Design a protein around this ligand. Structure first.
Ligand SMILES: Nc1ncnc2c1ncn2[C@@H]1O[C@H](COP(=O)(O)OP(=O)(O)O)[C@@H](O)[C@H]1O
Ligand SMILES: [Mg+2]
Length: 340
């Protein structure tokens, strides 16, 4: 039952990276440049060490990075100061541990460029915006919120995704609507029963590799670097994989209400704010959040498969017929937003 205070500490990360049989530098894709980070701005040109690259526009920004669209087929550039070789390590590892079939669920990194004061990562592109953006689009519409059938559908894919990541003994560490993105697969999704298509997960900067740590290690940090806090962090309790369970539930809560989840303690259990009576499938959602939020300990993680089945049951009873229309409607909204 080993203990590590902070898994996101820079000193710790440098120690793990430095203490590797296969340094990141060893990878073929990675490149180390002595010079400072090049000036990168939309509608400009610069050479990525060797070949010239054209940046068309800024797709999105986070607390750590700015992501631009680039060409010469289109891809993206993830720029951040200081350098973040860690993301490349995690991304590289993840594709290696994953089954080849499941790689399309996550962003692939083609190459990494490490500068003196920053890093630039070249990665796959997803052109139809984040899950958060999609949630915001509905607010303008009459429904004001995502249809349940799409919520449930997106939810089951998420549970399926973290299951694959956790099998790799990896923790995402930052599961939010901002870090979910919509790509072509969502557009071309033809098989509803296939959970591998229509949703992709990104932002591996805050990810944790459990392989590097002893068996049964635990973390006691009371918040994630951006300040993201799960239930264990609030309760001063230890945690490892629970943070991703909490993240999925927070992301699903957002699809349901279009507002970030807030937590409260009622009786002996932890519950989210405002699960009102008129909410469809209220029983199912109460059960879903109860399990995802109230985990007794690190050794009793809820079955991701079981949760998925409970949602699948409700989906098969009420939304198999209506799903195509709901997806088409969303597709039109995504196209409209992308036109802007
Ligand atoms: N592959 C991608 N395609 C399109 N946009 C992306 C891609 N990756 C990231 N983004 C955009 O970048 C923003 C944040 O990127 P992320 O990787 O989460 O960086 P950070 O760690 O700083 O949050 C997102 O809101 C998203 O719009
Ligand atoms: Mg992010």
């Amino acid at each position: 039952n080993f203990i590590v205070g902070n898994p996101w500490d820079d000193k710790l990360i440098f120690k793990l990276l430095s203490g590797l049989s296969k340094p990141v530098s060893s990878y073929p894709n990675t490149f180390e440049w002595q010079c400072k980070l090049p000036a990168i701005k939309p509608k400009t040109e610069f050479q990525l060490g060797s070949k010239l690259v054209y940046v068309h526009h800024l797709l999105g920004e986070g607390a750590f990075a700015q992501v631009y669209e680039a060409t010469q087929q289109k891809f993206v550039l993830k720029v951040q100061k200081p350098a973040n070789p860690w993301e490349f390590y995690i991304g590289t590892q993840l594709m290696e541990r994953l089954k080849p079939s499941m790689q399309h669920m996550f962003m692939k990194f083609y190459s990494a460029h490490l500068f003196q004061n920053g890093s630039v990562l070249v990665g796959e592109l997803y052109s139809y915006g984040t899950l958060l953006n999609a949630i915001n689009l509905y607010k303008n519409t009459p429904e004001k919120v995502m249809p349940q059938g799409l919520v449930i559908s997106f939810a089951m894919r998420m549970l399926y995704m973290i299951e694959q990541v956790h099998d790799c003994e990896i923790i995402h560490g930052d599961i939010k609507p901002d870090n979910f993105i919509l790509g072509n697969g969502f557009l071309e999704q033809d098989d509803e029963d296939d959970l591998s298509a229509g949703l992709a997960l990104i932002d591996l900067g805050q990810s944790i590799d459990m392989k590097l740590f002893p068996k049964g290690t635990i973390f006691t940090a009371k918040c994630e670097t951006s300040g993201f806090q799960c239930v264990e962090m609030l309760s001063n309790k230890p945690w490892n994989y629970q943070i991703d369970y909490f993240g999925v539930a927070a992301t699903v809560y957002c699809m349901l209400f279009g507002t970030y989840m807030k937590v409260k303690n009622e009786g002996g259990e932890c519950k989210p704010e405002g699960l009102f009576r008129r909410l469809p499938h209220l029983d199912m959602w109460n059960e879903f959040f109860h399990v995802m939020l109230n985990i007794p300990d690190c050794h009793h993680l809820p079955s991701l498969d079981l949760l998925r089945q409970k949602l699948k049951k409700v989906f098969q009873q009420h939304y198999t017929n209506k799903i195509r229309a709901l997806r088409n409607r969303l597709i039109v909204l995504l196209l409209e937003c992308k036109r802007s």
